Amino acid sequence: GGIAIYWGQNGNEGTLTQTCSTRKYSYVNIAFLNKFGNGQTPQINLAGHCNPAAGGCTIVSNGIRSCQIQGIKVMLSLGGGIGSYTLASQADAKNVADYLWNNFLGGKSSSRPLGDAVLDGIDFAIAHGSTLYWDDLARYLSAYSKQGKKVYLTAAPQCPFPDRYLGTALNTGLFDYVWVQFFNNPPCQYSSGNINNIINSWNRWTTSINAGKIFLGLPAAPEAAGSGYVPPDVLISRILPEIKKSPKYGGVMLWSKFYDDKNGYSSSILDSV
Numbered sequence: 001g002g003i004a005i006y007w008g009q010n011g012n013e014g015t016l017t018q019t020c021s022t023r024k025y026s027y028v029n030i031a032f033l034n035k036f037g038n039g040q041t042p043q044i045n046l047a048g049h050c051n052p053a054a055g056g057c058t059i060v061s062n063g064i065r066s067c068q069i070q071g072i073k074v075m076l077s078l079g080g081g082i083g084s085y086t087l088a089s090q091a092d093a094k095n096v097a098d099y100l101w102n103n104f105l106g107g108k109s110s111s112r113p114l115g116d117a118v119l120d121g122i123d124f125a126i127a128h129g130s131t132l133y134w135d136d137l138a139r140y141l142s143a144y145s146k147q148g149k150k151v152y153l154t155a156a157p158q159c160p161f162p163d164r165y166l167g168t169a170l171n172t173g174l175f176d177y178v179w180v181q182f183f184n185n186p187p188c189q190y191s192s193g194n195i196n197n198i199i200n201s202w203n204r205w206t207t208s209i210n211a212g213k214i215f216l217g218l219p220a221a222p223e224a225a226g227s228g229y230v231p232p233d234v235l236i237s238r239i240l241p242e243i244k245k246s247p248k249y250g251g252v253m254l255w256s257k258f259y260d261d262k263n264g265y266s267s268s269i270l271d272s273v
């Protein structure tokens with residue numbers, strides 16, 4: 001399979017171009033558009049990378065294009081651990097979808113946050129706030145694919161199944177890639193010497209929802225999360241030999257680029273993925 005990586009939440013983690021040039025990642029999720037819905041003006045946060053104001057982050061289009069010519073799919077990630085993002089109604093889901101189309105996809109806007117580049121799809125990283133209308137957002141975004149270029153849909157639900165926020169959206173069967181986050185959740189993550197909870201959780205996710213491919217989401221280092229880190233050797237010798245048997249296995253997802261370089265995680269597991 002391949003490795004999905006989250007980029008954008010630490011200005012010291014290198015440029016998007018450099019991130020994709022590593023040749024270790026097959027998918028890149030730009031984190032995050034952490035503010036939108038309920039009449040709020042959508043706002044993107046890319047840590048210390050760039051200030052989105054006055055097209056200060058339009059330079060990112062160079063990284064997006066650089067990744068795409070290298071066959072890497074790049075998605076805009078909605079939500080994240082911090083933000084006032086939400087959906088007040090189905091009408092809100094429509095407005096956000098139309099906004100996303102014109103500002104990140106094949107639509108048109110004089111103020112596209114990340115430039116003129118056209119993202120491959122949208123990533124759902126909904127962790128809090130509204131538990132409703134995310135299935136509507138997915139449906140509206142997916143319909144835009146009928147205009148010629150497919151709008152990919154990906155999701156980063158936490159490992160507890162079903163996910164309280166993305167459960168219904170995932171039930172639509174419209175998602176291409178689902179990287180379940182097996183961390184910051186004791187009941188379904190790795191614990192010292194115990195892989196039972198993570199494997200058991202993996203089985204729930206791969207024998208339920210209809211998605212293109214399912215990935216094993218993990219923290220790139222102990223610092224990347226409150227808990228759930230898995231040493232490279234354990235992942236390679238105990239976990240991968242099992243989950244790779246599943247025909248839905250798509251690979252591994254890591255949070256994040258910054259911690260990945262610091263701990264050299266993907267550098268150690270890439271060939272086994």
Ligand SMILES: CC(=O)N[C@@H]1[C@@H](O)[C@H](O[C@@H]2O[C@H](CO)[C@@H](O[C@@H]3O[C@H](CO)[C@@H](O[C@@H]4O[C@H](CO)[C@@H](O[C@@H]5O[C@H](CO)[C@@H](O)[C@H](O)[C@H]5NC(C)=O)[C@H](O)[C@H]4NC(C)=O)[C@H](O)[C@H]3NC(C)=O)[C@H](O)[C@H]2NC(C)=O)[C@@H](CO)O[C@H]1O
Pocket residue numbers: 006009010011012032034045046047048049079080081082083125127156181184223224225226255256
């Ligand atoms: C898929 C998923 O759900 N993933 C989650 C994941 O979200 C969790 O990780 C945590 O995510 C949150 C975001 O949701 C991370 O929060 C980051 O934290 C950054 C570090 O503190 C912070 O970056 C700072 O951003 C400032 C702007 O807001 C930057 O300041 C600017 O600096 C410029 C010079 O560099 C200067 O010119 C500007 O004037 C100045 N502007 C301002 C306003 O100060 C600052 O430089 C930058 N710092 C760095 C180091 O880049 C982000 O703002 C903040 N994001 C948000 C949206 O608030 C949090 O760090 C993540 N934690 C970890 C451990 O990774 C993850 C947790 O395990 O769970 C996953 O499931």
